[PDB]
Amino acid sequence: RPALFSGDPLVPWIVSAKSAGGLEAQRARLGRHVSGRLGATDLGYSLAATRAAFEHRAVVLGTTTEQLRTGLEAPDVAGVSSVSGKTVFVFPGQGSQWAGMAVELLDSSPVFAARFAEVASAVEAHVDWSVESVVRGADGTPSLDRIEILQPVLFTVMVSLAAVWQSVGVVPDAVVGHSQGEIAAAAVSGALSLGDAAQVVVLRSQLFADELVGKGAVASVSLPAAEVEARIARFNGDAEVLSIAGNNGPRSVTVAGQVAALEELVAELEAEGVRAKVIGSTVASHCAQVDPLHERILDLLSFVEPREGSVPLYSTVNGEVLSGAELDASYWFENCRRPVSFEPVVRALIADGFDVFVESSAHPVLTYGISETSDDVGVEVLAQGTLRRQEGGPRRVLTSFAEAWTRGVALDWTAVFAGRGAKAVDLPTYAF
């Protein structure tokens, strides 16, 4: 009963028809209708409540009915309904973050803010700062570039973003996480209590702040695993210095290890035109650097009481379909020690009849890998992000909703209008 949006955000006008020309005709008939009379938000509500959703779809965004009438000439999002399978929520690790993320959504979405408050309370049982204050960059707060601050803030943001989708009826049939993302995935599936998940992400990230910062990091590299193996061998003659930390798609991997070596590899790769980058604030998890921490991790996380969740969790640690009851301290050690097997799990999801992948994150980091993998398997899927860097408010949310819905995702657009005081108004008949 918190509304999705408060105040006076922009409005969506959703339109659909049975062909490309029919959708052009509907847009033209609406334009004429509006020119010749009408409240922007009443029309949006009416389009959402009173029209069938046919195959060819568009969404226009704006505030005034002039803006929205003008926009029918060039809708913000258009597509053709194509998905027909199950929905999995995707929770990435580090790489999502951007300066100022979540602030505008806290201010503009009561659904997001409410969930963010619940989850923040859970993490604040274990830290002495305020998650909201840190997110808002309040004076005196600790830096979000610190790993022990960032991971619990990312956790809070990813879990709370799943509630925004939930408010328009888009919910996971399964969940998949990447590295620390699995802790958010477990919180969403109910495999861990909010308290336990929060405490895991706080304590583990603090341990990493204490023992791994400066000793290593992780980089993304847009090459196939085999090619990257060939390029790192020269570093590893004596001991493991660099190692593949993740497989994200057929041409997308991550590499963990010593910072100097990692930077040398990234610069070499860039000089040959390859996209590569050190991921902000990362340490060298997912390699042998975490072995010395094994005993400490089991002691730190022994409190955890995992249980069978609402919805399965597709592990990127062991490639199993898990109930959630398995996610004990030993699991959370393996989660930070083993390379992330994300690409094989995407394959398995597609084979299990998933074709809607919703990345519940501040900036889409695994959607590219999901599409690339789906292309390799030869199956079309929707890989949809939530927010994006410097796009943090209602336009971005509505745009992501439109991107999903125009591709066939069932979405309850009527819920967007909660609290706006809208009413049904006359609309042109679908045909004369």
d(CA 174, CA 178): 14
For this PDB entry, the determination method is X-ray
Q: How far from each other are the two terminal CA atoms of the chain, in whole angstroms?
A: 39
Which residue spans of the chain are classified as CATH 3.40.366.10? Answer: 86-212+287-392
Task: Identify any residues that bridge with 253 across adjacent strands, giving them in sequence order.
Answer: 221, 247
Strand, coil or helix: 354: strand
d(CA 230, CA 243): 11
Which residue spans of the chain are classified as CATH 3.30.70.250? Answer: 217-278
d(CA 323, CA 336): 20
Which residue spans of the chain are classified as CATH 3.30.70.3290? Answer: 1-81+406-432
| CATH of span 86-212+287-392 | 3.40.366.10
Calculate the CA 203 to chain-centre distance: 23
Task: Please report, for residues 158, 272, 285, 326, 327, the alpha-carbon distance to residue 330 in angstroms, rounded to integers and kept in the order given.
Answer: 24, 40, 15, 9, 8
Strand arrangement, sheet containing 340-341: 276-278, 217-221, 252-257, 242-249, 340-341
Strand, coil or helix: 242: strand
Instruction: Provide φ and ψ at 146, rounded to 5°.
Output: -80, 135
* Residues 261, 125 contacting (CB under 8 angstroms): no
Strand, coil or helix: 77: strand
| CATH of span 217-278 | 3.30.70.250
d(CA 22, CA 33): 16
Q: What is the resolution of this structure in A?
A: 1.8
Closest C-alpha to 257, from 219, 206, 210, 229: 219
d(CA 195, CA 201): 10
Kindly state the DSSP code that residue 198 receives in the 8-state scheme: H
* Residues 313, 324 contacting (CB under 8 angstroms): yes
Closest C-alpha to 151, from 247, 262, 283, 259: 283
Strand, coil or helix: 8: coil
* Residues 255, 269 contacting (CB under 8 angstroms): no
d(CA 199, CA 302): 11
For 96-133, the three-class secondary structure string (H helix, E strand, C coil) is CCCCCCCHHHHHHCHHHHHHHHHHHHHHHCCCCCCHHH
Q: What does the block give as tokens for 345?
A: 């799990």
Strand, coil or helix: 80: strand
Kindly state the DSSP code that residue 36 receives in the 8-state scheme: T
Q: Tell whether domain 1-81+406-432 is in CATH 3.40.50.2000.
A: no
Kindly state the DSSP code that residue 391 receives in the 8-state scheme: B
Instruction: Provide φ and ψ at 128, rounded to 5°.
Output: -100, 5
Task: Identify any residues that bridge with 220 across adjacent strands, giving them in sequence order.
Answer: 254, 277
Strand, coil or helix: 205: helix
DSSP state letters, 131-180: HHHHHHT-TTPPPTTSHHHHHHHHHHHHHHHHHHHHTTT---SEEEE-TT
Half-sphere exposure of residue 195: CA atoms within 13 angstroms, side-chain side: 4
